[PDB]
Every structure is written in structure tokens, then in C-alpha cells.
């Protein structure tokens, strides 16, 4: 009986299990404390059980292990990781470990780890020798991320719209810029469930920071892959450590020649949190933001790449535009030009309720030649020629109109050529 099963179950199962075998007044404490107490009481019988989570190392040599369902929160559910484990299994941050856990004896509160049985979804012994991420060789996004879902709704119409306006590649680095109330979050949804439906092989990861709790809870119940989200109620350090540990966990996953995709909303919020938490360097720019603050989220964004010998790391991060606050710009032109692709949106298109609001002319990609073939490259270039003249709102109206009657993007291509 692993921690994951009772961690995932709702309150009803927890309270029923507590009242069945002798937990008193268990309904009036926080859920992480509830699972801690009930699992400690159950493990008082000395039955070793499996564990799951992601480990991290604090300032001291001792390390902790967290759970994904707990939104990567440090609490009573944390699992001990002794430094001896770090030496004897070359452990580093972000490795997902599965194995027997140790019930707590006198002198300790949390649960320790008896043994390891699965490191990064792999046998611990064969993972002792491994290639570090630092010396990996970046490469272009050769593999096209075919996200055309083909289900039959206007949401699929939006999917086809950014298929015709963007070239999403496996392992690329993408930025999304849009004004508030333009369609960012559920565009990221589109990306998430389209990747889930079209590419089940690759793992889906969605990172949300300082977002409203209702958005978090509707995102958690809509995406197939696991999603990590920390609301605005928590301090800046919460978001900072969430982002660090999630990006380095994705690093560890892609080190195993895996295809990892991270959807970030937003990156401006991450930069603001880092600026808040980082010590001042004494060299402040316009808007109350100093120099070294921007480095951390900016290397964070730069972590995305494609590995020549196996594995890819795609990051699709949103950037806020024209919100009336100067630092939002500061970040906007600080990250501008550092992404493999840019996706722009306009609020005025959303004003007339034409959706999505992607700016066809402004949106673009770097090195389209290597990603696709020559025939489809020219086939999209001729669309660029024919759709460039009229206005972007007129362009989108025209595109959605003559794409509504067409089942797929290809049939759209051969239906345009005859005209």
C-alpha cells in the first residue's frame, strides 16, 4: 500500500479509514497532517510499504522527499533522505524514487526510506552510471509535434489555427505574448490535451504560478498529465522552489532520453517572484528590478533544448503584455528574442469575440526548414502570401470561415490551391 493511493483519495475515504480502525477526531486537521497521522498509526504494525515522490536537498546535507499530489509542498508528509543515500546511490535533486519506507521510531517525526526499488522509473543499480545534463549537446527541433487533434469542435478549430500559424517542434523553446483576458490559459489547455491525445508517448507537465485557485482546480481536472500549481496566496519562495524543483526534475527526466513538455503560465510572474526573493545587487534597472534577479528565470527559460542522442525538453512559457506595469515590459524585452518561436495575440480581436486571437503576421518560428519538408514549407508559405495582405482580424475571420467547412488541415491546403 503506497502513499500515492491514499494521497489521491478524497476526504471521504480518509475519514472512513480513520473511523474504521480507531482514529478519533480526525476530521478537524489539515489533509497532509491527516494522511501523516493515519499512515503512522497504520504503520505502527511494522508493515513496510512502497513510496513515491520527488527528492530535493536543502542547505544541509540532509534531503527531503515530496509528493506530486501535495502540489510539491513541504509538510508532515515529507520523507527523510539521509546523505548516506546520496552517496550510495549517486542521488541528485529531482530523481523520482520508489521503494520501501521506514516507520518512524523514537527521535524522528517523518518517515524514512528503508530501501530503493525504482529510480526515475528504472532499476537503481543500472542507473548508477549516467550522463550529466551539462555536457549534453543541443540540437534543433527536428521532430514535428503534430497536435492536430481532429475531434470536431471549434476548440479543434483553434488547434488547427495555431497549426497553420505556428510550427511546434519537439524540443523547441517557445514564448507566448498576449494581453490579459485574451485566451492564454485555455490555449495552454489546447496544447496540453492535444499533446495528450496525439502524443501519449511523451510526458505532459503543466506548471502554474500565482494563479487563482479556481483556475488551478479546473486545470487539474482537465489535463491528462500531472499538473503542478501554486496559487498567489503562498509567498514568493513557494513559487521559486516549485519552479526550481520542477525544472530540475524535468532535467532529470530528459536525462533518461525522455520527451518532456513544460507549460508555464506565466514567466513574467516567475521573474517577479525571483526579483522579490533574490537579494539586491545594488544595480537596479527601470521598474524596481535589478540585474541579477532576471538571470534565474532567464536561465530557467534557456534550459529548454533538444538532445542529439536522445530526449527533448520543450518549454512553452507565457509572457504578460501591456498590463500597465513597467516591469512587465522590462521582462518582456529582456526575454524577447531568446526563444525558438514566438506566438503573439491581440486583445482587440478578442473584443469582437473572434477566437483565438493569434496575430498571424506577428507569429513566427525559427529554422522552419529543418523542422518540416520543402513541400509543406512552400504550402504554408503560399498561405502566408495570400493571408498577409488583409488585416489580422479579417485574416482570422477568413481563415476560420473557410476552415470550418474543412475537416483537416491537409484538405484545407488542397482546397485552397485550386482557388
Amino acid at each position: 500500500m503506497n502513499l500515492t493511493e491514499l494521497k489521491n483519495t478524497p476526504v471521504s475515504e480518509l475519514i472512513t479509514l480513520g473511523e474504521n480502525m480507531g482514529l478519533e477526531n480526525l476530521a478537524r486537521m489539515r489533509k497532509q497532517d491527516i494522511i501523516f497521522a493515519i499512515l503512522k498509526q497504520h504503520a505502527k504494525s511494522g508493515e513496510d510499504i512502497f513510496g513515491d515522490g520527488v527528492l530535493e536537498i536543502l542547505q544541509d546535507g540532509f534531503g527531503f522527499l515530496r509528493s506530486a499530489d501535495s502540489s510539491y509542498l513541504a509538510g508532515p508528509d515529507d520523507i527523510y533522505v539521509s546523505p548516506s543515500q546520496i552517496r550510495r546511490f549517486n542521488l541528485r535533486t529531482g530523481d523520482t524514487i520508489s521503494g520501501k519506507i521506514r516507520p518512524p521510531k523514537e527521535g524522528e517525526r517523518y518517515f524514512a526510506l528503508l530501501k530503493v526499488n525504482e529510480v526515475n522509473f528504472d532499476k537503481p543499480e543500472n542507473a548508477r552510471n549516467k550522463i550529466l545534463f551539462e555536457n549534453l549537446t543541443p540540437l534543433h527541433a527536428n521532430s514535428r509535434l503534430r497536435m492536430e487533434r481532429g475531434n470536431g469542435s471549434t476548440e479543434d478549430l483553434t488547434a488547427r489555427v495555431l497549426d497553420l500559424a505556428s510550427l511546434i517542434g519537439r524540443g523547441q523553446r517557445g514564448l507566448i505574448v498576449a494581453p490579459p483576458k485574451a485566451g492564454k490559459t485555455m490555449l495552454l489547455q489546447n496544447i496540453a490535451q492535444s499533446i495528450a491525445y496525439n502524443h501519449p508517448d511523451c510526458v505532459l507537465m503543466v506548471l502554474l504560478i500565482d494563479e487563482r485557485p479556481e483556475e488551478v482546480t479546473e486545470m487539474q481536472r482537465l489535463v491528462k498529465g500531472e499538473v503542478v500549481a501554486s496559487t498567489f496566496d503562498e509567498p514568493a519562495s513557494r513559487h521559486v522552489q516549485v519552479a526550481e524543483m520542477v525544472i530540475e526534475k524535468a532535467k532529470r527526466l530528459v536525462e533518461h532520453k525522455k520527451d518532456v513538455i513544460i507549460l508555464l503560465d506565466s514567466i513574467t510572474r516567475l521573474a517577479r517572484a525571483y526579483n522579490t526573493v533574490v537579494p539586491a545587487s545594488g544595480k537596479v534597472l527601470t521598474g524596481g528590478v535589478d540585474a541579477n534577479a532576471l538571470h534565474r528565470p532567464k536561465r530557467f527559460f534557456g534550459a529548454a533544448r533538444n538532445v542529439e542522442e536522445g530526449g527533448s525538453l520543450t518549454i512553452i512559457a507565457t509572457a504578460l503584455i501591456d498590463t500597465g506595469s513597467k516591469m512587465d515590459e522590462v521582462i518582456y524585452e529582456e526575454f524577447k528574442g531568446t526563444g525558438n518561436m514566438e506566438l503573439h495575440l491581440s486583445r482587440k480581436i478578442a473584443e469582437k469575440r473572434v477566437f483565438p486571437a493569434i496575430d498571424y503576421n506577428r507569429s513566427g518560428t525559427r529554422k522552419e526548414e529543418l523542422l518540416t519538408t520543402q513541400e509543406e514549407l512552400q504550402k504554408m508559405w503560399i498561405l502566408r502570401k495570400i493571408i498577409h495582405p488583409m488585416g489580422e482580424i479579417d485574416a482570422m475571420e477568413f481563415l476560420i470561415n473557410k476552415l470550418a467547412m474543412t475537416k483537416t488541415n491537409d484538405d484545407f491546403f488542397e482546397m485552397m490551391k485550386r482557388s
Partner: protein
């Protein structure tokens, strides 16, 4: 085989559509009763108006699905009757159609299509003449009961309840609303 499954699909779709109809009627009479009553339940009135809306959308969807199933049943019946009539009198049809139906395999695609449309037109005048002389038409004896249960045309309530057209963005937002209301009613 296919006709039986299509028939039960159509009948259960009709049952579901009737279920949605009486649910919408009950919600409408409840809302009218609370409007007529002196009780000033603004929140309850808004909730009932949302219920009326979502029930109307569900009735529209049920009517559309029932219409589609009815059309599928009729199409399958027509196809089966034509298949067996053709297996019976293929030589009889071909004796009349020979002037432009022989050498079908060796004819090119455009010639094949032109011959097909010519025969199509000719049989169309044949059908209109047969209907002009005008007997009383009756169902095939093999599958009469299924067709008479289904009927020649669907209910007028089905066709006029599906008169309005909803953009599929509205369809999906109503899907979320209906799921939320079903969850709330279950709770």
C-alpha cells in the same frame, strides 16, 4: 442484424428524448409556479432559469440524435431492401439498362460517370411515372413491424425542437453546464 440494433438504438433515443421533454416541462412549470408565487426567491429564480436553459439545450441535443438515428434506420432499411431486390432482379434491370451499362469495366472513369448519371436520370423519370399512376405504397413484409414502429417521418416535436441552431462553442459550454448541474443534482 443491423436493422435490429438500429431499431433499438432509435427507440431508446426516442425514450431519452421524451425523458428530456418531460424534465424540461416539469422545470418550466416549477419556474412558472415560483414566479406566480409571492415568495421572493431571486437566487432560486435564477437557478431555475439556468435549469430551463440547460434542459432546453439537452432536449435539442436529444431531438437531433433521435433524428439522426431515425435517418440511419431508414437508410439501412432502404439499402437492405435494394440489395435483396437487386439480387432478385439484377438481370431484369440490366436487360433494360444494357444500351449504356455494358462494358462498364472497360469504360473510362468519365464515361462510367456519364453513363451512371444517364441511367440515374432515366430511372428518375421511371419513378415519377410510377408515382404519377399512383397506387397505395406499403412496407416490405420482411421488416414491416420495425418500419411501422419507426414511422415514415419522425415526430413534428422532434423536428421543431431542433429548429434552432447552436454554435458548437455554445454546445460545449452547455456540455460543461449540464455536467455541473448533473453533479449538483446528484449531490
Amino acid at each position: 442484424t443491423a436493422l435490429q440494433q438500429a431499431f433499438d438504438t432509435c427507440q431508446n433515443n426516442k425514450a431519452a428524448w421524451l425523458q428530456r421533454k418531460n424534465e424540461l416541462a416539469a422545470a418550466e412549470q416549477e419556474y412558472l409556479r415560483l414566479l406566480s408565487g409571492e415568495g421572493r426567491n431571486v437566487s432560486r429564480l435564477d437557478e431555475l432559469r439556468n435549469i430551463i436553459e440547460v434542459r432546453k439545450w439537452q432536449v435539442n441535443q436529444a431531438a437531433g440524435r433521435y433524428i439522426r438515428s431515425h435517418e440511419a434506420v431508414q437508410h439501412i432499411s432502404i439499402r437492405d431492401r435494394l440489395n435483396d431486390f437487386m439480387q432478385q432482379h439484377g438481370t431484369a434491370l440490366a436487360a433494360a439498362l444494357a444500351p449504356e451499362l455494358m462494358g462498364y469495366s472497360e469504360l473510362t472513369a468519365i464515361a462510367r460517370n456519364c453513363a451512371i448519371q444517364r441511367a440515374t436520370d432515366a430511372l428518375r423519370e421511371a419513378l415519377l411515372s410510377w408515382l404519377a399512376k399512383g397506387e397505395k405504397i406499403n412496407y416490405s413484409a420482411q421488416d414491416s413491424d420495425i418500419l411501422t414502429t419507426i414511422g415514415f417521418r419522425p415526430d413534428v416535436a422532434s423536428v421543431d425542437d431542433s429548429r434552432e441552431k447552436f454554435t458548437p462553442a455554445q454546445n460545449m459550454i452547455f456540455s460543461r453546464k449540464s455536467a455541473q448541474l448533473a453533479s449538483r443534482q446528484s449531490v
